[PDB]
């Protein structure tokens, strides 16, 4: 079972990819500006189960092109 | 200032994995710090490509870079967590969690 | 919240560091009633116990309140 | 600017190995350049420790460092050389000479 | 069969080591002053067959404490 | 300078077919002694040495036969013996059809040399000519195309 996902990321080779699930990840290093990537995931399902922090928001979904229009936030709190 | 193993304590609350990891709350996963300076030691166990790239780097330091100090062997730990459905699962050998040895590659 | 038997089995494996159990994976699924259980496809099941007492109900789990399952890759 | 495999042509005369290496005079031994920035790609094939250290690095960039982009698989080449005694030797699979794959470790 | 070699290097734990052969290596980084090491060698004997360059002079020998008083040059 | 045979063997390894021999070594000739009536005999001395953990798969002997005042069919023959004491031991007998290099398999002699459980590194080569297309012919001996050994071995 493979799913096609939206691919908006420097790691992308084309506008879509195929993988085990779809991901939208919003990362902020402590010193730098935040970045957002969209792509496929195949190896580390544990990242999907993690709670969002002030640095990373790792979102996953299992539908075809489910990662296209979803929006995420980051918060220092 | 050379490739070696350093202590690093990982607290799962810091990375947001406390939501699904039940135990342990924190554990010792080492780090490989230091540089790979020629001549490369035996305990580092350098590969043939690492030696070649190092010798080439010495002539062209701006074009080619040095070898890197990375973990060359990983040890597993025991962890109790919850999967996607929430079932409490206990794995005796959660592989790839701790650094056994370092080296230059 | 997980049962206290899963936590006790955890403290048994880490403390000795030499238990070396036969199966690396252990799961805990929560009159006559039933529960929804899912074991992975590639792994092979080792043991099943309906649990307080212990009942080796390994025959039924191959096809179909904390039952404990032992499996391995 | 991300972990990938780059071309690197090694000319044995530059490192002084032309004295004992008969053929080839130069060959393609790749290099792994780029950084390991979260999220780490799948083709990088990160380990569990690589994921943990990267997430911890995001919180403490000065105390903990990122995973390094290193060769994760090496391919052999055929070489004709002279041994210690001077005997012309030809090895079909001189292992560890060329980079097959890169990754973050 | 292991040989005893002079050990003058940061990796040394004592004045001598035991290894398959003895080595004297002179390295010069493009920006820094050259450094000279004396120790044991066990893994890559091919380095011994290379000709000295302007950056590295890797010398090997198979005798007892043969690496003690030898001095090397670069270029 | 390495023999051209090793270089050509390298170019054959690179061009596209999974060789059965992982290691190939080339041993040149150390000394040779000519003997002087019915034919032309030489005694060749080598110094073959192979690591014990490797297993020999093939051993060749490369010679160069020709004559002065040079048919595609001049009848010659090379016979080679393994020298032990002063007794010999038969190895090969190859008919010669034209001038140039010749490859003679002598695997058993090298195997006895490596696992030296019993003299070694010495063999006597005799050459005869028959027809009139070339009266006398012999191997090239040092006074250019000196003979050498080629050992094929695997690291098993
Ligand atoms: C268990 O229930 C979930 C939803 O509650 C369902 O998605 C899953 O398929 C069930 N297990 C099995 C083995 O069908
Ligand atoms: C000739 O063979 C002997 C072994 O019988 C070996 O010790 C010697 O080193 C060889 N000659 C040379 C020049 O290496």
Numbering used by the authors:
A (entry chain D): 30 to 106
B (entry chain B), D (entry chain E): 325 to 429
C (entry chain C): 84 to 113, 131 to 151, 202 to 214, 252 to 260
E (entry chain A): 30 to 104
F (entry chain F): 84 to 99, 102 to 121, 126 to 159, 163 to 178, 188 to 219, 222 to 246, 249 to 261
Give me lines lifted from the publication on this model:
Bone morphogenetic proteins (BMPs) are dimeric transforming growth factor β (TGFβ) family cytokines, initiating cellular signalling by forming a complex with two copies of type I receptors and two copies of type II receptors, both of which are type I transmembrane proteins with an intracellular serine/threonine kinase domain. Activin receptor-like kinase 1 (ALK1) is a type I receptor specifically expressed on endothelial cells, mediating the signals from BMP9 and BMP10 exclusively. ALK1-mediated endothelial BMP9 and BMP10 signalling plays many important roles in angiogenesis and the maintenance of vascular quiescence. All TGFβ family ligands are synthesised as preproproteins, processed by furin-like proprotein convertase upon secretion. It has been shown for several family members, including TGFβ, BMP9 and BMP10, that the prodomain remains tightly bound to the growth factor (GF) domain in circulation.
To address this directly, we resolved the crystal structure of the human prodomain-bound BMP9 in complex with ALK1 (pro-BMP9:ALK1) to 3.3 Å, providing insight into the interaction of a prodomain-bound ligand with its high-affinity cognate receptor in the TGFβ superfamily. The overall structure contains one copy of the BMP9 dimer, two copies of the ALK1 ECD and two copies of the prodomain. While the electron densities for BMP9 and ALK1 are excellent, the prodomains have overall poorer densities, with one copy heavily truncated and both copies missing the α5-helix. Regions of the prodomain that are in direct contact with BMP9, including the α2-helix and β1-strand, have good densities. In the crystal structure of the pro-BMP9:ALK1 complex, we observed significant proteolysis of the prodomain. We speculate that the binding of ALK1 to pro-BMP9 may destabilise the prodomain, rendering it more susceptible to proteolysis; hence only the regions in direct contact with BMP9 are highly ordered due to interaction restraints. Nevertheless, this structure suggests that ALK1 ECD binding to pro-BMP9 does not lead to the dissociation of the prodomain, in contrast to a previous report. Our result is in agreement with Mi et al. that ALK1 binding only displace the α5-helix, not the entire prodomain from BMP9. Importantly, the prodomains in the pro-BMP9:ALK1 and pro-BMP10:ALK1 complexes are in the intact form, i.e., the α5-helix is still present, as confirmed by the size of the prodomain on the SDS-PAGE. This study confirms that ALK1 can bind to the full-length pro-BMP9 and pro-BMP10 complex without displacing the entire prodomain.
